[PDB]
Amino acid sequence: AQIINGVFSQLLATFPASLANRDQNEVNEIRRQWVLAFRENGITTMEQVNAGMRVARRQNRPFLPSPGQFVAWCREEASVTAGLPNVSELVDMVYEYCRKRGLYPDAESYPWKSNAHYWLVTNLYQNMRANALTDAELRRKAADELVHMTARINRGEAIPEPVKQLPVMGGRPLNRAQALAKIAEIKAKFGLKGAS
Amino acid sequence: INGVFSQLLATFPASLANRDQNEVNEIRRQWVLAFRENGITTMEQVNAGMRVARRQNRPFLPSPGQFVAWCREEASVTAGLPNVSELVDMVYEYCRKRGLYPDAESYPWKSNAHYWLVTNLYQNMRANALTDAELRRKAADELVHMTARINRGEAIPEPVKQLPVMGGRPLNRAQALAKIAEIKAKFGLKGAS
Fold this sequence. Notes:
Chain A contains 8 helices and no strands.
């Protein structure tokens, strides 16, 4: 009650024009929605309120944010490990990969920033090439992949470290003359080569 | 701090209309917290923000985030970008006139930003069969993206160009016929005559 009233007062102070030209019924409904969101998200501490207010002040939008946006702002400090590119950055990375991957032996040789980037870019690239997606479909798929990856990260879990595929060996100290001698020796031993 | 709040109240007297002391104190606390977080602790930045607010024609009190956005926009006000209508007119003029030029770099561009915006919009329109409303939406998105890139400090690349053409041939009909005859004599091929 007191916490909710303080949050509402601070939001009104930060955003005076948010409730302009609005009757009391809309204000009460907005307050009820905020109460429901706080109860469902477990936001019952003043420290989270202060963090959310700091983020809101850092935000430059002159309108009242949605309750879910405020909850996300509060949890950003808690969920600081969720360092992932946004939709636009992911799309640009996918385009750069689609341009540059032909110059590398495999997908693991690409200069990845982290495993999350590797998995996201590879999945989006394969999906796009297999399903012949357009740009808007690619962006929708990128948003879905980001949501899925964030959900997996927030549930703990560990991102696997590719698979790689074998070494290539090498180290041949053999020249033309010695190999010709070897071929001649094989011919002499097997006799019926008849090759000239 | 207190002087900053007093100047803000003086510039926007209608902001505290029908407000009690508690709301004023909460507004002051919010402004103090915003200044602390944004690093606005010097009087020179306060004066710059006051000048920005005075240049604005809105008597309404902007949010502290909006005030910081105004300050950083005026600090980086160097942006010679057209509006949506001007961009659409430029795109239409380009689509009318570019057929008479050897390449897209020969077009009389005003700057690099205009070149990139117009070319990207032209390619997108001719590739996705955009209508007029879709063209305007795409133009708005492109302008937002270009402004965001410019505010990041990133420089705008200088097209790519493609090759010179050379020339300078002082050869006429008689000399060309002599050359052809010499080629025929050297290699035979008498059937060509």
